Amino acid sequence: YHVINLSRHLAIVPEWEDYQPVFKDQEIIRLDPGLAFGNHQTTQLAMLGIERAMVKPLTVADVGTGSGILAIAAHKLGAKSVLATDISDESMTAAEENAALNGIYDIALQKTSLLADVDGKFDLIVANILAEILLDLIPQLDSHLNEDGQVIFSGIDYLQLPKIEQALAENSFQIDLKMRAGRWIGLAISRKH
Amino acid sequence: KYYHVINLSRHLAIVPEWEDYQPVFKDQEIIRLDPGGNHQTTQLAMLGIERAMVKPLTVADVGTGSGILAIAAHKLGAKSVLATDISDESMTAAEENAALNGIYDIALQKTSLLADVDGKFDLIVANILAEILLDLIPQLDSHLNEDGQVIFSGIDYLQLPKIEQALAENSFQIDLKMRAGRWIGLAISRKH
Secondary structure, eight states: OOOEEEETTEEEEETTOOOOOSSTTSEEEEEOTTSOOOOHHHHHHHHHHHHHHOSSOOEEEEETOTTSHHHHHHHHTTOSEEEEEESOHHHHHHHHHHHHHTTOOOOEEEEOSTTTTOOSOEEEEEEEOOHHHHHHHHHHHGGGEEEEEEEEEEEEEGGGHHHHHHHHHHTTEEEEEEEEETTEEEEEEEEOO | OOOOOEEEETTEEEEETTOOOOOSSTTOEEEEESOOOOHHHHHHHHHHHHHHOSSOOEEEEETOTTSHHHHHHHHTTOSEEEEEESOHHHHHHHHHHHHHTTOOOOEEEESSTTTTOOSOEEEEEEESOHHHHHHHGGGSGGGEEEEEEEEEEEEEGGGHHHHHHHHHHTTEEEEEEEEETTEEEEEEEEOO
16 A cells, blocks of 8 residues: 555545645545555546536535545535445445545435435536446436536446447437546546537 | 637636636636637646646646647646747747746747757647647657656547557557547556
8 A cells, every 4th residue: 555646636545644745735535444445547537527527516426435535535626515325334434434534524425225315416426336337327317417417437347338328328418528547437427418 | 719718627727818717616726828729639638637747747748839738737736847839829829828827937949849859758748630649659758757658639539540559659558548529638658
């Protein structure tokens, strides 16, 4: 373990480290490796999408939050609100504890599969999860997305992209930005316009 | 043409010199431009720069045009920035746009690509036609520091296979490929 530089404005650091970034305004996100949850490439793709999308405070749902990394980054980047969801107790623990390590106590957490039983709508839905689960998320997006709502997917293997692209088209979503690092794909998504 | 605010990212917006813009986020940097390639290719190159600038890097912006990418790199905390173009009009625009943002230490050189450029850089940025990028590719090695990175934008997706070929032949690899509409941006580094 050491510092994972994601961008000019984001680095990830293990909780024990005493790290001073050369850029004083580069945000440092502390994570506890002893807790559950990831993939550095897919995290970076999702983060670049969030950096692109967050031109004003947006309401955010981070689906399949795992360690909470993306929910935490969204909060630091000025989200209007953040809901983080996952299926496991240990994700709920990791997200809360990792948030707290970064001095954040107001990220809302819900133990739930995808967006089942999530009442509100959001400006930004973010999901770094495997493509077969994304396929189940796609038909849920519309009813949980504000008008002008945007979506960021990551964790897509390149071989899975046709199936993702077809399901997005079928649900009237377009891809504004496609990113590929190694075999991994990230997408910035909005309603067909 | 008419020019409006271009909201690039959380940390950057491009604003026409005259336009009074108060960003919602207090710390979203504003780049002022007179008048002010296009939106899409600029945004891809910017994402590349945002990803790459994890510490102060020495930067070369090739085919600078308005000087937008040179200025953005400077604002994101580049150690130094050299901007090149063949055109006298571009040299003027880049100088004036830099001054409009209170920047006076971007180096400017009127030259084709990296011919006549002495020295090497941590980061080479070029948002230009793919045909010109093809000529730039063999110039990269001798102008790039070890662990140096290269950002290309301005590629139409149909012209990508020839760029990929020329990069491979010059012992470069693509770390990140970005596509928005028909436009391609690339983050590039030395192979192994």
